[PDB]
């Protein structure tokens, strides 16, 4: 009874020979081709522009720290930024940043010269690395730097940026020291007054336009990612797939997760109302999160499979009958396809000539074996 619809009728009626008539042997169902998912335009963007594009940055010894959470980390703007000169990530692939989730994101921003950019990395040495900004050995994040001569330098020399020249001990990882105590370089106490063995721990950077890229100010923003056991608060925004019409798919509109086919509609909804229901409390139509339109949702076409056969002792040919479904969503198709109100019957040649009714189909259509 998997061979042919006539064999299916034999299977259902449990008899080798079946009398002339109509019998319901099975039911037809349109399996959805694929699944579709759409999400609205994301507005919970992380304040990347606030941290990266800020008018005033603090000094390297007083680097500002910004905690980022409960938002989507859109690195696309970072990728499209062509002014970046250094983009090195430790413990994470730069192309995998949008595909990875982190419990918390910390943004560190400061201004340093061109030749000190290489000092902002795990395991590095130097004045900035040891006295101004130190990274841990297992640091997970990315280091971003770019030229900032146009904004952090002026004609008269911008000394507003300072670095910790002298410190008694190297800075611990992720430690910000802003102490202005007089450095004691000798046995003689300073007592708050600089002298032969006493110097200020901070030195003002001399920024001039003609210094050169080797000695030009650079805006550096460091993003640190930590993976803890707490639920993640920073995740890449979801991607909205292309909208589909007139084709049965699986749609998940922000939790509707329904099945069927979406078709253009004419009804108008409330400005706030998104999706509607029928009398039977079932899904009826959903509004596009992207655009502003209403799409009717009829369930995927399905119905019983009927077989029209004459007496097996008289003939051996059968015609499939697909009720309640049009011929488009369809023995295989292509053999005298005919459509009626009852459905799409396949395997019989429609004729205008009118005879007395023999076999029931529905809607005034009767089939019989003749020439």
């Amino acid at each position, epitope marked *: 009874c998997a061979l042919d619809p006539l064999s299916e009728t034999k299977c259902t009626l449990k008899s080798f020979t079946v009398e002339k008539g109509i019998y319901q042997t099975s039911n037809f169902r349109v399996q959805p081709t694929e699944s579709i998912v759409r999400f609205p335009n994301i507005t919970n963007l992380c304040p990347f522009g606030e941290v990266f594009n800020a008018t005033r940055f603090a000094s390297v010894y007083a680097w500002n720290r910004k905690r980022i959470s409960n938002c989507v980390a859109d690195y*696309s703007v970072l*990728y*499209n930024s062509a002014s*970046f*000169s*250094t*983009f*090195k*990530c*430790y*413990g994470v*692939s*730069p*192309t*995998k940043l949008n595909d990875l989730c982190f419990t918390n994101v910390y943004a560190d921003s400061f201004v340093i010269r061109g030749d000190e950019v*290489r000092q902002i*990395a*795990p*395991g*590095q*040495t130097g004045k900035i690395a040891d006295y101004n900004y130190k*990274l*841990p*050995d*297992d*640091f997970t994040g990315c280091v971003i730097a770019w030229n900032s001569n146009n904004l952090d330098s002026k004609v008269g020399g911008n000394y507003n940026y300072l670095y910790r020249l002298f410190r008694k001990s190297n800075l611990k990882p992720f430690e910000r020291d802003i102490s202005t105590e007089i450095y004691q370089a000798g046995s003689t106490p300073c007592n708050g007054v600089e002298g032969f063995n006493c110097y200020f721990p901070l030195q003002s950077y001399g920024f001039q336009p003609t210094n050169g890229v080797g000695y030009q100010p650079y805006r550096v923003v460091v993003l640190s990612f930590e993976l803890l056991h707490a639920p993640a608060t920073v995740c890449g925004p979801k991607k909205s797939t292309n909208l589909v019409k007139n084709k049965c798919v699986n749609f998940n509109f922000n939790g509707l997760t329904g099945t069927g086919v979406l078709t253009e509609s004419n009804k108008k909804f409330l400005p706030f109302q998104q999706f509607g229901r029928d009398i039977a409390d079932t899904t009826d139509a959903v509004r596009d999160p992207q655009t502003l339109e209403i799409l009717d949702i009829t369930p995927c076409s399905f119905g019983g499979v009927s077989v029209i056969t004459p007496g097996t002792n008289t003939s051996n040919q059968v015609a499939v009958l697909y009720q309640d479904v049009n011929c488009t969503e369809v023995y295989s198709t292509g053999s005298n396809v005919f459509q009626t109100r009852a459905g799409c019957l396949i395997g019989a040649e429609h004729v205008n000539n009118s005879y007395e009714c023999d076999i029931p189909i529905g809607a005034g259509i009767c089939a019989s074996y003749q020439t």
Partner: antibody
Amino acid sequence: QVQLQQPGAELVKPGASVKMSCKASGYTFITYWITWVKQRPGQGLEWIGDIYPGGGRTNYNEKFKSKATLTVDTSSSTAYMQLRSLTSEDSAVYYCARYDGNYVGYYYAMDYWGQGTSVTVS
Amino acid sequence: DIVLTQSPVSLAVSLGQRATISCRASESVDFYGNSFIYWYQQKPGQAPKLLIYRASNLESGIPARFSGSGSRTDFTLTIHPVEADDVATYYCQQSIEDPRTFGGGTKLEI
């Protein structure tokens, strides 16, 4: 200026372990990653792992996770590659290279290469 | 794991002619307009030498004859003219996602 050196050849008994060096010079060792590539005689190139000398961060290939135990010595600016449970399939030439790992510049490009070491297991 | 196939495996090019090497990627390598495909030349008995980085830029010290193109799955490297000392093995490498893998390699004959 930049010189990267590897031992000429190494011979190891089957079932033993071999630890070979990757000596880099002419540039700041800690500022550049050290990557490793395996090339079977007459075959293509296979990646093993990459390490950053600063902090000792490691990233091992899934195929060579149980085979490659990689450590570096920043004092001598030399990277040590250790192989364990060697079989006849592990007889190949291993090359250590460097990459800056900058999305802006060169990404994973391997501009400089070492002379390599012909490892024979017999 | 992205697998890279290089065709033709064996190529013969006369003096001054053009050599065509194509590397195919099983998965897309382009990322925001950046293609991470590298071409390496390995002389016999010597380590491979990088020629083209990011599949479109010439490495310093590499002659201008070597040139690359292609994007996404398909990448093409063109060498013109081809000299006598070009006999080596050319490898294409992808680095968009770990683990990084290399191509099968091609043989150039004069």
